[PDB]
RNA sequence: AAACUUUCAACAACGGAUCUCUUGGUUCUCGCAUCGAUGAAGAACGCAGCGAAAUGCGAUACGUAAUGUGAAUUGCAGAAUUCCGUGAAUCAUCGAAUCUUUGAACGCACAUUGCGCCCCUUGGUAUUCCAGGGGGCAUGCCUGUUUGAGCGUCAUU
RNA sequence: CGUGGAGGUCAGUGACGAAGCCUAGACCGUAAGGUCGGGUCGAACGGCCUCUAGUGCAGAUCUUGGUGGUAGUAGCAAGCGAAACCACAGCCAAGGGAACGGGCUUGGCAGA
RNA sequence: CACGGACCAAGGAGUCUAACGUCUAUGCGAGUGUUUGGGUGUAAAACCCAUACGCGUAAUGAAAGUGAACGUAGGUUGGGGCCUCGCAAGAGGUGCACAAUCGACCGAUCCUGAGGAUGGAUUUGAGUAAGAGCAUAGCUGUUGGGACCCGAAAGAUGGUGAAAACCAUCUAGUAGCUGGUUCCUGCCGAAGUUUCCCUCAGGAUAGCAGAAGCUCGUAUCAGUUUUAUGA
RNA sequence: GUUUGACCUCAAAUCAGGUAGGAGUACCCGCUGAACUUAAGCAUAUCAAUAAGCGGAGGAAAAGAAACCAACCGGGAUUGCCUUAGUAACGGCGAGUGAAGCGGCAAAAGCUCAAAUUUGAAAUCUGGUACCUUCGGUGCCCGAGUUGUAAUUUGGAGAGGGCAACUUUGGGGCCGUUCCUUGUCUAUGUUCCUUGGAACAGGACGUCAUAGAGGGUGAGAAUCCCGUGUGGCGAGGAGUGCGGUUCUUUGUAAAGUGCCUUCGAAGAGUCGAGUUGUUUGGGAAUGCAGCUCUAAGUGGGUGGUUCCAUCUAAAGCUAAAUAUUGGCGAGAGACCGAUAGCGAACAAGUACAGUGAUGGAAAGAUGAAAAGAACUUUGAAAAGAGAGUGAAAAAGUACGUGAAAUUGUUGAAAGGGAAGGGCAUUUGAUCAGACAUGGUGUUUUGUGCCCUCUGCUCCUUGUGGGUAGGGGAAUCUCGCAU
């Protein structure tokens, strides 16, 4: 080749990358329990039995709980604004509990929202406060 | 490659020029100029059948037949004469097939290893190799194949703990995991017989890895092969009670010399 | 045995690698044992040569033999020992070109940077 | 004149790819739950195969919604249509035995 | 008989076969995506104490700075270096520099090392002018910006 | 039978001289060739059971390289110095069936 | 006659592949074929395998169909072998493959016409007799690939030069041909041509020389003589 | 208002910010397009939806989420492989050309516009400028933009509300893991003897091995050096993949799900039609282009025997599986070994030749180290002679081995107008030609593995083996020595 031919010939230096072992072993990045259960100089699917999960859900071309329990473990384990709160005041003071005489009047609820949403809201209010 | 011979711009000068017809490189004053190319018998010139990549280089084999072979090779490693045609000083082992406990295995240390191969007898086969180093004998020195020394035993194993890695730096010894038995190492150069150390495990293993007229066989629809003869010697049968009795009286080996 | 993929047991590569390293693979290259008695100070098998450090020749003709390294000559891959000098027919005095593998330190030159290199090596100046 | 020298070399390309997949999609078992199809054609009829997506009516019968189904790796198909009974009833039974399997990790 | 011619042998010549080697080639496989108006690929002129190609480099010119290594370079000559350290080296790395004349080539030009213009300007009082230093002025097109032009359209108690 | 390389084997041979090269040297094989002595050499190589192929040369007005006769000739408009060409040699008579005599047959003859 | 040979060294020519066969070997066998792939691996090796597919396993036809036992899957005759007798020589029985003969089943015929029933007329068949294939390898043939090696008059594409050209690729262009084709020994061993395709060209065949399988090993014949019986 | 002011359009500038060209080109995407050659001459078939030329891209490209295939107990983006298959089909049925759906697998990922109003508030963006935690954020100003920029929707529908005493919830640092680049540490003989210049060889004696790949070192080195093998300690970067660690989360905010209620628009000089060419093996001109005319909305496109099935064109985006003689960087070989292998292992696309486009070689090896021959001497120079270095110059910068042709010298032989060859022999020259030495039968003695006394030890069947201490030849040839 032409170009090669300079590349081998200069003092310049090749760009040498060594870069082939890192192609095979590859770490295991977006599980910690499995980080720390992952047997390397097992394969993938070999890895995955000796586990429990499943590594494919089809029915595979060709031939062939410690960790599980762990997993299971990790899955045993929102408040209203400061204008909603005393606009709710304001509502509760006026009325009481009629939703109907609440949605029907126009000074104070002037979005006109239905008596679900107003009664929902309440609900919410009635938790945080009296 | 498929340019060379072809990088030349080679012309015929034609017919009764008093010069060989051979197509002769154009142009001047260089020395290549007037001079033969694109031929087999010329000098630069482009080789009788270039060689292409899309040669049969790989062979396809039927899977029984494959199988078949295998199964001769381990056969074989269980004769104790076999083994000793095909090399292996095999004198000083204490039986054949050679059989070691299943804690062999286990061991991590190469030094630790060669020593149990030592104390079972294979001491003498592990000399022959060590003392068998040569040269290659060809350009095979310059092509990466520059050292070629004997083949020593097969150590077979059910499963690793440390053994496929205590051996493999003890020249000649190779390992195989029982359900593989690669046929290139049993039965090396086409010549039968390894010299094969078994473990305990493996060699229980192999009932199931094969099969037997008791167990089923681990491979699917595979069974051994049948013997088309029912002894494998023929002077049993030949100089038999019975034979000899059917038989017409014999001869001197060896005419005498009538007239 | 080769396990790693990286590296190459080819011999082609393998030569050309070597005779075509620069001074500074050069000096790691020319590595001398140390003799026993600074193996046993030391608690190091072997080290990179330099100049102004004593040496002891065991192998070749000038078997045995003694002397302080002048120039390592990085190019030629050799050290050039003083008082091991082959003397021409003119009279004067040549150098002989020993290999440092060949070589033995009897005496180390100690810097800041040699003092350091001993200690990551595992010594105990 | 191609020769397919790289027969070896591709099987070892496409397995360290599946080992990539497996390593960046850890728990996950590298493809998505896919139907159970039978096949087109007088002759395949006899064949049941694995199909390329559900439909939202397997998925909605199941007890899951679609845009939700193809977070938990499910393969949803939208053209695909559901004529027959006893297909319709196996891929059910298929989603909801897939559904006591999965372990949704949560979110925080 | 000698000489001469021829044959054989021995010793010289001539030639570079054979053998052995090999920092080269060829083929297969694997991985990655990385040129250019911030001026590339390419051409030319040069540059080292002493150089042909090659390699490196651009008046900072087989280099400068930076980082690491830790004491050479060596074909020859000659300098060095405080060598318990800001440090030898045609060392490695490479991110900051300079980067001649050209070349898509870009101030105007044809094949003129000519023909200029503007800005910044240190010097020769420099108010005249003279010289030096430094950066720009190609084409098309997009987003703007701006001074306009247009009986192109409308408004106008 | 032989050559380049591959697997196997001979715990083969080998700086106390491998391979190669010669040799008015010896032995074996009908032969292809194989083995040995002597001389020269300086670093790898061979037999055996198998594998594989860019494997064996007298020719192609063969390709490349080298070296002759021609010739110290033609020549330069005592020295310098080719090329064309080249199976091999060049006495006559007679016979050699076949528009073939230059090698044969029978004669004449023939001195460097 | 003519073409080749001054001499010497080295180089130098039936190769590789695909398609389709031949025979032999090996594996298994009404099946057979792992290697597109997946799993695994001491890593292009080796070792495992899912679902499919390829080819074969049950035929007779033209649009529409039907379907193989009167059966020791036949009656006879032979027929390698085997059994009884005989010292043998022979005789008798059972008879494989195979061959000859008589037929049948199935489909298709020539009619009879209850849309085609029914009975007769006969033959027909890579038909059934009651499966032999599939795959690998070796030997080799046929055809295409540059195709044993070298050699011809060319056109086209794109470019360079110039008071009709050259360069580079297509192009290793195409040959109804010329020259050359590389080790030894043993054994067998021709032909010089029949007849039409018309021949001219290339062949289609028979003849001469083999290869293998099958019956026999004989009374199978012979470039011959003799007797017998004709023009 | 005979002023002036809105716009629209055309300008401008050495203003501000940008960007396009060229090289490379193996692969890919377009455009253009021969001839030698095959069937018999050549218009198709055929070379060939080739080569050259032209334009354009990237790490891949292209393709792609159906206006699809089907006729089934339906499949379901695209790409590739296996197979379908040398089948259907076409071809003066001939040179032959040559698919596709299904099936197995590789890899899998989907979505964004245009479409009916944010109209109770252009909710959007560019740019300038000022700061900030700078691949950007914020304030302010300017412009674009209603000839429509944001949010909401893309048929899988969707939206408007209502009911669930429904369900879910951002973002920024910090230290780690991970990825990239780079540095550094990690076993064991230079132990004896022989030979050689030299030990890396032979022999004896040992160690290490997750290291006996490879390379160097004065010849074949696991153990001399570098590495290799298994591990460890780092430095500088990348980064949203997640682990932890926090700092802040707000607004009557952003969705999701089921039920009930009211609505509910989907691309035209396009589809199609005739014709002239191109494309194919395409039989239902397939595909495309040119030219003429040019639609519909319980629509329209495509297929199946009178209906039925199937999608929704005329807008767009998208990884992976796939290609790769280039580039960048590796790892390899039953490859070639200097007339081979690339043209080039070396001052190689160099020397050189051609006006020019272009054409284009030859040429590797001294030794371990130059120790490259000092110094005397022969000659103006060219080369020699003594002498020396080295293991060897019987290795000399004409340099490893040094073949044949061919050339000289010397020696031997032969030669009256041919030699070389075969059978046989003489003469001349010359080379082979035992470190061969016993064999047998008796006789002195002297020893031992012999007789005899006492034992010890390995194992398998009697028909064992190894190995000590004493004695004794007057019996014994049992062996070996004289």
């Given amino acids: 080749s032409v170009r090669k031919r300079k590349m081998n010939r200069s003092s310049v230096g090749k760009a040498t990358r060594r870069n082939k072992d890192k192609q095979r072993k590859i770490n295991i990045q977006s599980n910690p329990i499995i980080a720390a ?23 595979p071309a060709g031939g062939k709980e410690t960790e599980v329990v762990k997993k299971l473990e990790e899955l045993a384990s929102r408040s209203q604004s400061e204008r909603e709160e005393e606009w709710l005041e304001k509502l509760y003071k006026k009325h009481g509990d009629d939703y109907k005489k609440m949605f029907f009047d126009k000074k104070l609820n002037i979005y006109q929202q239905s008596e679900g949403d107003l009664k929902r809201r309440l609900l919410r209010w009635k938790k945080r406060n009296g | 490659s498929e340019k060379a011979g072809h990088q030349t711009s080679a012309e015929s000068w034609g017919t009764g020029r008093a010069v060989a017809r051979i197509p002769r490189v154009g142009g001047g004053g260089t020395g290549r100029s ?3 190319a694109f031929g087999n ?4 010139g482009r080789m009788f059948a270039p060689t292409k990549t899309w040669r049969k280089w790989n062979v396809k084999v039927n899977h029984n037949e494959k199988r078949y072979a295998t199964a001769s090779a381990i056969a074989a490693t269980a004769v104790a004469s076999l083994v000793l045609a095909r090399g292996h000083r095999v004198e000083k082992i204490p039986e054949i097939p050679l059989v070691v406990s299943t804690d062999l295995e286990s061991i991590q240390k190469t030094k630790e290893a060669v020593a149990a191969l030592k104390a079972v007898g294979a001491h003498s086969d592990l000399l022959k190799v060590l003392k068998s180093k040569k040269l290659r004998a060809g350009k095979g020195k310059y092509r990466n194949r520059r050292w070629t020394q004997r083949r020593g035993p097969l150590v077979v194993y059910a499963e690793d703990n440390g053994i496929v890695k205590a051996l493999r730096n ?4 190779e390992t195989a995991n029982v359900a593989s038995l690669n046929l290139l190492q049993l039965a090396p150069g086409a010549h039968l017989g390894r010299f094969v150390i078994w473990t305990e495990a493996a060699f229980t293993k192999l009932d199931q890895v094969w099969g037997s007229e008791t167990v089923a066989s681990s491979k699917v629809g595979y069974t051994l092969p049948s013997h088309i003869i029912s002894t494998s010697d023929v002077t049993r049968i030949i100089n038999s009670s019975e034979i000899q009795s059917a038989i017409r009286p014999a001869g001197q080996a060896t005419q005498k010399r009538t007239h | 045995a080769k396990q790693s993929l990286d590296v190459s047991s080819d011999r082609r590569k393998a030569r050309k690698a070597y005779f075509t390293a620069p001074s ?5 290259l020319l590595s001398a ?15 990179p040569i330099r100049r102004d450090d004593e040496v002891l020749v065991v192998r070749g003709s000038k078997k045995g033999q003694e002397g302080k390294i002048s120039s390592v000559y990085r190019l030629k891959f050799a050290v050039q020992v003083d008082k091991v000098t082959k003397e021409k027919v003119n009279g004067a005095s040549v150098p002989i070109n020993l290999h440092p593998s060949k070589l033995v330190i009897t005496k180390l030159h100690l810097d800041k940077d040699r003092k350091a290199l001993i200690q990551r090596k595992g010594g105990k100046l | 004149v191609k020769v397919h020298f790289d027969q070896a070399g591709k ?3 496409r397995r360290n790819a599946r080992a990539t997949r497996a390593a960046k999609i850890a728990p996950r078992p590298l493809d998505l739950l896919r139907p159970v199809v039978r096949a087109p054609t007088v002759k395949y009829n006899r064949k049941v195969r694995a199909g390329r997506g559900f439909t939202l009516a397997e998925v909605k019968a199941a007890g899951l919604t679609a845009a939700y189904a193809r977070t938990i790796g499910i393969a949803v198909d939208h053209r695909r249509q559901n004529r027959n009974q006893e297909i319709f009833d196996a891929n059910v039974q298929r989603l909801k ?4 399997k999965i372990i949704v990790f949560p979110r925080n």
């Fill in chain 1, 37 to 59: 259960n992952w047997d390397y100089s097992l394969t993938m699917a070999q890895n995955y039995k000796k586990l429990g999960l499943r590594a494919k859900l089809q029915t």
């Fill in chain 2, 34 to 36: 007037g001079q033969g």
């Fill in chain 2, 41 to 44: 018998m010329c000098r630069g």
């Fill in chain 2, 170 to 173: 003890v020249p000649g010894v």
């Fill in chain 3, 24 to 28: 500074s693979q050069r000096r790691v």
């Fill in chain 3, 33 to 47: 044992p140390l003799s026993k008695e600074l193996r046993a100070q030391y608690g190091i098998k072997a080290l």
């Fill in chain 4, 11 to 13: 099987k070892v390309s």
């Fill in chain 4, 97 to 100: 035995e897939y559904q006591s």
